[PDB]
C-alpha cells in the first residue's frame, strides 16, 4: 500500500512512504514501478519533504532495472544521499555504473578542444571523486590511476600520481607503460609533460625517466634546459650519457636545435656527445675489430652462378656481410667475376662497395677517392653514377659539408646517367636536413622529365622532407605525378610522397584518402605506403581499417601487395599479433598477396621470431610460384638475424635451404634470386648487427622504418637494397667511463653458452670491447661491480651507458 | 566385497568429473566452464541415484601441488557428517582449483540431501551451501578471474537453491533466499546471466498461491530476456508457471498454447505425479475454452490415475446432467484441490453451456433460435436470445443475427478458401515457418 | 593494474573486430 500513503497529501506521510519503500524495494518492485511516475514528481519536487530520499527510492525502482542513466538522474535528486551510500552492495554497482557514465561524458569533454565541454553533474562527479579518494586510501597506484585518464583530467591525474604518496613506481617508468596503452597523443602529451615535471620535483630527476619528455615531447629548449643544469652542476658524466642517448633514441631536427642552443672545454664536449658521430665511429671500430664473417659461405654461393641475377645477388649479399667492416676481401679475391657484371648491375655494385665502407665517414670519402671514376674507369658512366650513390650511402643519416659538396658535384654532374644514383645518394645523405638547396636540386632532377633519374630524385625528395608535413612539397610531388607520363617516375614519386608524410597519425589522412581515391594504381600504392609511414609503429585501427578495405577492393595486384607490406610497417611496435593477420592472407589465389604476406610477416616481427611466424614461413617457401618463393627466403632471413640454433630449431634448416636452392640448377633462377641475398641478410655485419625499428625507450627508429619500407620497393628497384643497409642496429653495448677513454670492462651475462655461440655461464670484454651480444643476454647480463670499472648506469639493456671508475 | 564395489565406481566417476572440469577450466574462456559441467551435473544426478565413503573421498580433496592420484590412494586407505562437510577445507586449503573447490563443496551436499533428514542436519547442509554461496558471491565480485564459476558453479548454486527449497518445503518458505537470488539477478545484470531466477520466482508465486496473485503479476513485469533457454527444461518450467499465471488471470486461450509448448519440452521421464501436472493444466484450460479435448491422444498412465476425476468430468461436460457434474465435483474434489487447479474447475461449472454453443457454431451454419433453445435446454426463447449474445462472445464466426425471422443466422466466414479472402491467412502461416530458417544461421555460427 | 588490463583486453577485442571484418570482405570477393 505504498501508493495509498502517497494518495494522502501529508508531508510526514511523504517521509513515511519513502522509508517504507526503502525497507522492502525487492518485495514490491512493481509497486514502485506502478507509482514511478508519482515517485519521479516527488524526487524532482523541492517541496517534497525528502526529495533526496525519494531519489534514493527512485534508484530502488531501477534496482531490478539496469539503467545507469536513470541512476545518474537519481543522483542529481539525491545529492548528498547518493554520496552518503559510499559503499552499499547493489548501490555500489549503480554508483560504479554512474562512474562509467561519468568517464564516457568526461572522455567526450576531452574530445572537445574548442571548449564548451558539457558540464559533468556535480553530484555524479562527487560520487566519482569520493570513490577515487577511496582508491587513494587503498594505496593501489593502479586503483588510483583507475579514473585518472577515464576522467581525462590532469588535475585528478596529479592526485592519482600522488595516490597514498608512496610514489615509487609512478615516480620512474610508469609513464612508459601508460604511453604504450595510451590512445590519444594530445591527452598523452599533457600526461607525459606533467609526469616528467613530477620526476623533476623528485630531488634527483632520472635522465632515463626525463628521457621520455626529451624524445616524445621533442622540445629542443627542454633538453637544452636539462643540459644547461648539467653544465651548471658540472655533472659531465651524467651529461655525456643523456646527449648520446638522445642521438641514438631520437632523430636530429629538435636535437639539432638543442645543439644550436648549446653552441650559442665543457662546451666542446657537450656539442661532441650530442653529435654522436664518435659513437658511430666506435660502432665502425666494433665491426672492423669483430666480424663473424665466413668467406667459405660466400665462396659456396659464388661457385653456383646463373651469370645474371647471381652476380648482383652475391655482390649485395657480401656488402651486407661487410657493411661498415670495410673488409671487401670477396671483391679482392675475384676480378674477372666482378668484371662479368654489366653496366647497371656494376653501378649497383659500386654502391654496394659504399655499404661495405659505410663507417669511416670522412675517412671513407678519402678511401672512395681510390674508387673514384677518374682513378678507375672514365668510360663507365654507370660506375661513376654508382660512385656518387656510394658516397651518399657512406654519409647517409648524417648532415655535413660533404653532403653540400655532393650537391655541388650534382650541379656539375651529367643530367641523367650520373644523377641516376647521384640524386639518390644526395637525398639519402641529406635525408631529414630539409635544406632548400637540396630540395631545389631534387626538383630540378624531377623537372628533368627523365623517369629513371626522376625515380631516384622522387625517393630522394621524400627522404630530405621526411616527416616535414610540408604542404608545398606534397603539392609539387602529387602535381608532377599527375602530369608525369612515365610510370617509373610515378613509382619513385609514390615512395617519396609516403616518406614526406612520416608519423602524421592523422595529419596526412586527407592526402591518404586522395591517393586511394586517385584512379592511377601507382598513386593508390603510394596511399597504402602513406598509411604505413603516417602510422609507422602504430596499432591504430583506422590505419588498419583503410588498409583492410583497399587490399580486398583494389583489383591491381601491385596495390594489393603494397597494402600487405603496409600492414607490417604499422605493426612493428606490436609484432605478437603480426603473424595472425598474415596467416589467412599468406594462403590466397594471388601470387602477389601470398608474396606480400610473407614479406609483411617478416617485417613486423623483424629480428624477433614469433615461432608461429617462423612456422608459417616454411610452407610459403614450398609455394609453387617462384615470385612468392623468392619473397619467403628473404623474409625468413630478416627473422633469422638476432637468432641462433638454440633459440630457433629451423634457423640452421633455413640456412641449409638457402645453400640447397643456390646449389640446385633445377630451382628457378627467379626463385633462388634472393636466397643468396637472404644469406647476406642473416650474415649482415658478420651477424653482429640486426634489424630493429623500435628503441628500448619505445621511440620509432627513423633509419629502420625508412630502410624496411624502401626494401619492399627493392623488388621494384634493385638498388633500394642499399637503403636496407642503413637500418642495421648493432647488438653490441657501449661502456666508456670517459668519452675519450676506453676502460677494461668485463660484464658477465651468466647465460647458457649456446646463445653466445655464433656460427659455463659467463661473459668478458677487454678495454671497452663493444662486441655482438644477444639482446636476451643483455637483459640477463651482470655488470662488473667487483671490477674497478663498473657501469654508473644500470646495464639493463645493451647501448651507450654511463660508467663509473674507482 | 559387494558394499565396496559401489564406492569404487562412484569415486572413479567423481575423479573423472573433477579432472575434466579442471582441465577445461585451465585452458581458454567460455569453453573453459560448462563445456562438460552439464554432463558432470547429469553424472552427479546418476551418482545421487547410486547413493559416508563419499565424504571420506571428499576429505582433503586438494592440498597444494597436484596429488589427486595419491589422494585417491589415501581415500582407499581410510576404507582400509557435519565435521566431514567442513573437514577438507579445515584439513588443508586447496591452494588452487577455485572452480573445483565449489564443485568439491557441492559433492557432500548431495548425500546430505539424499539422506532427506528433514532436520537441523539438513539445515546444516543449507549452512554448508551458504558457505559455498559465499565463494560463488566472491567468484567475480572479489576474485577478478573469468566467470568459470558463474558459467558452471551457478548451476551448482541452482542445485543448492533447490536444496534450499527442500529445507523451506520442510518448513515454510524463505523470501530472503529469493532476495539473495535477486542479488544473483544483479550478478546476472553484469557480464554473465543465468535464468535460475525465474524458477525460484515461480516457487515464490507458488508459496503465495491463492492468497496472492500479485507475485504472478510482478513476475509478468519481472519477465526480461534469457531466450537462450539452454536448459530447455528451465524454459518448460518458466512456461508451466507462465501458463498457470495466464490461466488464473482468465487468459485461457494464450495459456493452452503455452502449456502445449511446455508439455512438448519434457526430456526427463516425469513418469509419476510430474508430467501429469503439466497435462492437467492443459486439459482444464482447453475445457475452460469450451472446446472438448478427448484424453485418448496422450493418456499417460500416471496422468490416468489423476484423470479418473477429469475423465468423468469431461464426460459430464458432454452430458446435459448437472447432477452427474455435481457427483464428480463432490466425489473427485480431492486431488484436484491438491493440484491447485480446483478453482478453475469451480469456474468451469458455469462454462458447461459454452461448450454446447461452440459445437452448434461448427455444426450449424444458420441454426434456428428455438432450435438453440432445445439443443442447450434453455428455459425460454428469450433466454436463448440472451445466450446467443453470450454465444457471439469473442473468437467465433459473426452471428449477424437478424433478431427476427433470421434468428441465429450465425453466418460462418465465407470465401475462406485460402484464396484472396484468406490471402493474408495462408501467406502469414508460411512467413513463420520461413522465419525458422534462422536455425541455418544459428548452427552455422557454432563451429 | 586492473585499470591497465581493462584497456589491454579492450584493445584485443578492438583489433579482433577490425580483423574480423577483413575475413568476411575477402570471403565475399572469393565468392565472386
Amino acid at each position: 500500500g505504498i501508493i495509498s500513503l502517497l494518495d494522502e497529501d501529508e508531508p510526514q506521510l511523504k517521509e513515511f512512504a519513502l522509508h517504507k519503500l526503502n525497507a522492502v524495494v525487492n518485495d514490491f518492485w512493481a509497486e514502485i514501478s506502478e507509482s514511478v511516475d508519482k515517485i519521479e514528481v516527488l524526487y524532482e519536487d523541492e517541496g517534497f519533504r525528502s526529495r533526496q530520499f525519494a531519489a534514493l527510492v527512485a534508484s530502488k525502482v531501477f534496482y531490478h532495472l539496469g539503467a545507469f542513466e536513470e541512476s545518474l538522474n537519481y543522483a542529481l535528486g539525491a545529492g548528498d544521499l547518493f554520496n552518503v551510500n559510499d559503499n552499499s552492495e547493489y548501490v555500489e554497482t549503480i554508483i560504479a555504473k554512474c562512474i562509467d557514465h561519468y568517464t564516457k561524458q568526461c572522455v567526450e569533454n576531452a574530445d572537445l578542444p574548442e571548449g564548451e565541454k558539457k558540464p559533468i553533474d556535480q553530484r555524479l562527479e562527487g560520487i566519482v571523486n569520493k570513490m577515487f579518494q577511496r582508491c587513494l586510501d587503498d594505496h593501489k597506484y593502479k586503483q588510483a590511476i583507475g579514473i585518472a585518464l577515464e576522467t581525462r583530467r590532469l588535475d585528478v591525474f596529479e592526485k592519482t600520481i600522488l595516490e597514498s604518496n608512496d610514489v615509487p613506481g609512478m615516480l620512474a617508468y610508469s609513464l612508459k607503460l601508460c604511453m604504450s596503452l595510451m590512445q590519444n597523443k594530445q591527452f598523452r602529451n599533457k600526461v607525459l609533460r606533467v609526469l616528467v615535471k613530477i620526476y623533476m620535483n623528485l630531488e634527483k630527476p632520472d635522465f632515463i625517466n626525463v628521457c621520455q619528455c626529451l624524445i616524445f615531447l621533442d622540445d629542443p629548449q627542454a633538453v637544452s634546459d636539462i643540459l644547461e643544469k648539467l653544465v651548471k652542476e658540472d655533472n659531465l658524466l651524467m651529461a655525456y650519457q643523456i646527449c648520446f642517448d638522445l642521438y641514438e633514441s631520437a632523430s636530429q631536427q629538435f636535437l639539432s636545435s638543442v645543439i644550436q642552443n648549446l653552441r650559442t672545454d665543457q662546451t666542446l664536449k657537450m656539442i661532441k656527445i650530442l653529435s654522436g658521430e664518435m659513437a658511430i665511429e666506435l660502432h665502425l671500430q666494433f665491426l672492423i675489430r669483430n666480424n663473424n664473417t665466413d668467406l667459405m659461405i660466400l665462396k659456396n654461393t659464388k661457385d653456383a652462378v646463373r651469370n645474371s641475377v647471381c652476380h648482383t645477388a652475391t655482390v649485395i649479399a657480401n656488402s651486407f656481410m661487410h657493411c661498415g667492416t670495410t673488409s671487401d676481401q670477396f671483391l679482392r679475391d675475384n676480378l674477372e667475376w666482378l668484371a662479368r657484371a654489366t653496366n647497371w648491375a656494376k653501378f649497383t655494385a659500386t654502391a654496394s662497395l659504399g655499404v661495405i665502407h659505410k663507417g669511416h665517414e670522412k675517412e671513407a670519402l678519402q678511401l672512395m677517392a681510390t674508387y673514384l671514376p677518374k682513378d678507375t674507369s672514365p668510360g663507365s658512366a654507370y660506375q661513376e653514377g654508382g660512385g656518387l650513390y656510394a658516397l651518399g650511402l657512406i654519409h647517409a643519416n648524417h648532415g655535413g659539408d660533404i653532403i653540400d659538396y655532393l650537391l655541388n658535384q650534382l650541379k656539375n654532374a651529367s643530367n641523367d646517367i650520373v644523377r641516376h644514383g647521384g640524386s639518390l645518394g644526395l637525398g639519402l645523405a641529406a635525408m631529414g636536413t630539409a635544406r632548400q638547396d637540396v630540395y631545389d636540386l631534387l626538383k630540378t632532377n624531377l623537372y628533368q622529365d627523365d623517369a629513371v633519374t626522376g625515380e631516384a630524385a622522387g625517393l630522394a625528395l621524400g627522404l630530405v622532407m621526411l616527416g616535414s608535413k610540408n604542404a608545398q612539397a606534397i603539392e609539387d610531388m602529387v602535381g608532377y605525378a599527375q602530369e608525369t607520363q612515365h610510370e617509373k617516375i610515378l613509382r619513385g614519386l609514390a615512395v617519396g610522397i609516403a616518406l614526406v608524410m612520416y608519423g602524421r597519425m592523422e595529419e596526412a589522412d586527407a592526402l591518404i584518402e586522395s591517393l586511394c581515391r586517385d584512379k592511377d594504381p601507382i598513386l593508390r600504392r603510394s596511399g597504402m605506403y602513406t598509411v604505413a609511414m603516417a602510422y609507422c609503429g602504430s596499432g591504430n585501427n583506422k590505419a588498419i581499417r583503410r588498409l583492410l578495405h583497399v587490399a580486398v577492393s583494389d583489383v591491381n595486384d601491385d596495390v594489393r601487395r603494397a597494402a600487405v607490406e603496409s600492414l607490417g610497417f604499422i605493426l612493428f611496435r606490436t609484432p605478437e599479433q603480426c603473424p595472425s593477420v598474415v596467416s589467412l592472407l599468406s594462403e590466397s589465389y594471388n601470387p602477389h598477396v601470398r608474396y606480400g604476406a610473407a614479406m609483411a610477416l617478416g617485417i613486423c616481427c623483424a629480428g624477433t621470431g614469433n615461432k608461429e611466424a617462423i612456422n608459417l614461413l616454411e610452407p610459403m617457401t614450398n609455394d609453387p610460384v617462384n615470385y612468392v618463393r623468392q619473397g619467403a627466403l628473404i623474409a625468413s632471413a630478416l627473422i633469422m638475424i638476432q637468432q641462433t640454433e638454440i633459440t630457433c630449431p629451423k634457423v640452421n634448416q633455413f640456412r641449409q635451404l638457402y645453400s640447397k636452392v643456390i646449389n640446385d640448377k633445377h630451382d628457378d633462377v627467379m626463385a633462388k634470386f634472393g636466397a643468396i641475398l637472404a644469406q647476406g641478410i642473416l650474415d649482415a655485419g658478420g651477424h653482429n648487427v640486426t634489424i630493429s625499428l623500435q628503441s628500448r625507450t619505445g621511440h620509432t627508429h627513423m633509419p629502420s622504418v625508412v630502410g624496411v619500407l624502401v626494401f619492399t620497393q627493392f623488388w621494384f628497384w634493385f638498388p633500394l637494397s642499399h637503403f636496407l643497409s642503413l637500418a642495421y642496429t648493432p647488438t653490441c653495448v657501449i661502456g666508456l667511463n670517459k668519452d675519450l677513454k676506453m676502460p677494461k670492462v668485463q660484464y658477465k651475462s651468466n647465460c647458457k653458452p649456446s646463445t653466445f655461440a655464433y656460427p659455463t655461464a659467463k661473459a668478458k670484454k677487454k678495454e671497452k670491447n663493444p662486441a655482438r651480444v644477444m639482446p636476451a643476454q643483455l637483459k640477463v647480463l651482470t655488470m662488473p661491480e667487483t671490477c674497478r670499472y663498473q657501469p654508473f648506469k644500470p646495464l639493463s639493456i645493451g647501448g651507450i651507458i654511463i660508467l663509473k671508475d674507482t | 566385497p559387494p558394499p565396496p564395489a559401489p564406492q569404487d565406481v562412484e569415486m572413479k566417476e567423481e575423479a573423472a568429473t573433477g579432472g575434466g572440469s579442471t582441465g577445461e577450466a585451465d585452458g581458454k574462456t567460455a569453453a573453459a566452464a560448462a563445456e562438460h559441467s552439464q554432463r558432470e551435473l547429469d553424472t552427479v544426478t546418476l551418482e545421487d541415484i547410486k547413493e559416508g565413503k563419499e565424504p571420506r573421498f571428499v576429505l582433503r580433496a586438494l592440498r597444494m601441488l597436484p596429488s589427486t592420484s595419491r589422494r585417491l590412494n589415501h581415500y582407499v586407505l581410510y576404507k582400509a557428517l557435519l565435521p566431514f562437510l567442513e573437514e577438507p577445507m579445515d584439513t588443508e586449503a586447496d591452494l588452487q582449483f577455485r572452480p573445483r573447490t565449489g564443485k568439491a563443496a557441492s559433492t557432500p551436499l548431495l548425500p546430505e540431501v539424499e539422506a532427506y533428514l528433514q532436520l537441523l542436519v539438513v539445515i546444516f547442509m543449507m549452512n554448508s551451501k551458504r558457505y559455498k554461496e559465499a565463494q560463488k558471491i566472491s567468484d567475480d565480485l572479489m576474485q577478478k578471474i573469468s566467470t568459470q564459476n558463474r558459467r558452471a558453479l551457478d548451476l551448482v548454486a541452482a542445485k543448492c537453491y533447490y536444496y534450499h527449497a527442500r529445507v523451506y518445503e520442510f518448513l515454510d518458505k524463505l523470501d530472503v533466499v529469493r532476495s539473495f537470488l535477486h542479488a544473483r539477478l544483479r550478478t546476472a545484470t553484469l557480464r554473465h546471466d543465468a535464468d535460475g531466477q525465474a524458477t525460484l520466482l515461480n516457487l515464490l508465486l507458488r508459496n503465495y498461491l491463492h492468497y496472492s496473485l500479485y507475485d504472478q503479476a510482478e513476475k509478468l513485469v519481472s519477465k526480461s530476456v534469457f531466450p537462450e533457454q539452454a536448459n530447455n527444461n528451465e524454459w518448460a518450467r518458466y512456461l508451466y508457471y507462465t501458463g498457470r499465471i495466464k490461466a488464473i488471470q482468465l487468459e485461457y486461450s494464450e495459456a493452452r498454447r503455452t502449456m502445449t509448448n511446455a508439455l512438448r519440452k519434457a526430456p526427463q521421464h516425469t513418469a509419476v505425479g510430474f508430467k501429469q501436472t503439466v497435462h492437467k493444466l492443459l486439459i482444464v484450460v482447453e475445457l475452460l475454452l469450451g472446446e472438448i479435448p478427448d484424453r485418448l491422444q496422450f493418456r499417460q498412465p500416471s496422468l490416468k490415475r489423476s484423470l479418473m476425476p477429469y475423465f468423468l468430468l469431461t464426460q459430464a461436460v458432454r452430458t446435459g446432467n448437472l447432477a452427474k457434474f455435481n457427483q464428480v465435483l463432490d466425489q473427485f474434489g480431492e486431488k484436484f484441490q491438491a493440484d491447485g487447479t480446483y478453482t478453475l474447475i469451480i469456474r468451469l461449472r458455469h462454462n458447461v453451456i459454452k461448450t454446447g454453443v461452440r459445437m452448434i457454431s461448427l455444426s450449424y451454419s444458420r441454426i434456428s433460435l428455438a432450435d438453440i433453445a432445445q439443443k442447450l435446454q434453455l428455459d425460454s426463447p428469450e433466454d436463448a436470445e440472451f445466450i446467443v449474445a453470450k454465444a457471439i462472445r469473442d473468437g467465433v464466426i459473426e452471428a449477424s443475427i437478424n433478431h427476427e425471422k433470421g434468428y441465429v443466422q450465425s453466418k460462418e466466414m465465407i470465401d475462406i478458401y485460402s484464396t484472396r479472402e484468406p490471402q493474408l491467412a495462408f501467406h502469414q502461416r508460411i512467413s513463420f515457418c520461413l522465419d525458422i530458417h534462422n536455425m541455418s544461421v544459428k548452427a552455422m555460427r557454432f563451429p | 593494474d586492473l585499470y591497465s588490463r581493462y584497456k589491454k583486453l579492450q584493445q584485443e577485442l578492438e583489433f579482433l573486430e577490425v580483423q574480423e571484418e577483413y575475413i568476411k570482405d575477402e570471403q565475399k570477393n572469393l565468392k565472386k
Partner: peptide, 28 residues
Amino acid sequence: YLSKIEELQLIVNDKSQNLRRLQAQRNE
C-alpha cells in the same frame, strides 16, 4: 569494481575470436 569488472566484460567479447576462426575456415 568499476575498472576491475569492466575488464571482465571485455573477456565476454573474446568469443568473437572463435567466430573469426569459423570464418577463417570458410576463407580457406
